[PDB]
Curated annotation (Swiss-Prot), chains A, B:
It comes from Alcaligenes xylosoxydans xylosoxydans. Cytochrome c' is the most widely occurring bacterial c-type cytochrome. Cytochromes c' are high-spin proteins and the heme has no sixth ligand. Their exact function is not known. GO terms for cellular component: periplasmic space. Gene3D superfamilies: Cytochrome c/b562. The keyword Transmembrane helix does not apply. GO terms for molecular function: electron transfer activity; heme binding; iron ion binding. Heme c binds at R12, Q13, D67, C116, C119, H120. One of its GO terms (biological process) is electron transport chain. It is found in: Periplasm. This is Cytochrome c'. Homodimer. The lineage of its organism: Bacteria, Pseudomonadati, Pseudomonadota, Betaproteobacteria, Burkholderiales. It comes from the Bacteria. The modification Pyrrolidone carboxylic acid is found at Q1.
Length: 126, 126
């Protein structure tokens, strides 16, 4: 869906920005600094689930650029392992949200955050 | 969810960028230049539906900036009419996609596009 590589870059950056806001806005809730409304969090995690699937297809062949380390295309299977582990971690977060359990949410949120950081450390340029 | 107004601006711009890619990538299909796969379009419209709901809450009080004309906050009810007409037009697009009908999709796509342009002309800075 991208006319030029720059268009894929701008898409993925926007998806990651949004996806990120939907993750990070839950931090006060997971810390107990804001109240826990199970329905509010369930709805937000549903948005995060949809967003979380979007970036990867905008790292297609020929889409090099932004802060994407070149190692993303040359090691495709591995990049794919990091992405699929992250979304599996998002499935767990959904399960915790859908069940309405703050303890399970906290644990699942932590796991997701670790997956974000793992991909960051390997595949995002300094 | 925004620490500073600039954070709301960056969110809404990213949401509009994404939302826009998901709309515009269907243009070749609606024109017949690309093939029509009903399931592909149904799935894409579902993503568009989710995205289409996201920008508006990032035009909250105190979030002035970007290319948002000042007229967005001083005329709140009206801004709201433009937003709600656009999402009603997105409901119709979903119905056309979910039914699997290229003629209804084309008409509904046109209606959505007109709603984008209407808000643009009134509320987006040159
Ligand atoms: C690899 C499988 C990733 C996972 C999982 C997550 N992110 Fe990431 N992110 C990744 C790359 C390769 C990049 C660079 C993209 C580019 O082309 O520039 C990024 C970037 C971000 C950004 C910055 C986006 C921008 O506006 O330029 C943010 C805010 C970000 N990533 C956040 C983030 C979060 C919160 C994640 C888990 C919820 C996460 N990312 C996962 C690669 C990967
Ligand atoms: C008002 C109810 C709007 C509707 C409906 C749509 N858009 Fe719009 N858009 C609107 C504003 C006020 C702005 C400016 C936001 C800012 O603070 O800068 C925009 C901006 C865009 C952009 C640019 C985003 C960027 O990266 O800076 C795009 C690509 C865009 N809008 C596209 C678009 C499409 C395709 C729409 C219908 C599917 C649509 N917008 C509707 C206001 C409104």
């Amino acid at each position: 869906q991208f006319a030029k590589p720059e268009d894929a870059v701008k898409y993925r950056q926007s998806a990651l920005t949004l996806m990120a806001s939907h993750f990070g806005r839950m931090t006060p809730v997971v810390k107990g600094q804001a109240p826990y409304d199970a329905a509010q969090i369930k709805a937000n995690v549903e948005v995060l689930k949809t967003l979380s699937a979007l970036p990867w297809a905008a790292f297609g062949p020929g889409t090099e650029g932004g802060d994407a380390r070149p190692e993303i295309w040359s090691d495709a299977a591995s990049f794919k392992q990091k992405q699929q582990a992250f979304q599996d971690n998002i499935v767990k977060l959904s399960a915790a949200a859908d069940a309405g359990d703050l303890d399970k949410l906290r644990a699942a949120f932590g796991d997701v955050g670790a997956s974000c950081k793992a991909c960051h450390d390997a595949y995002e340029k300094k």
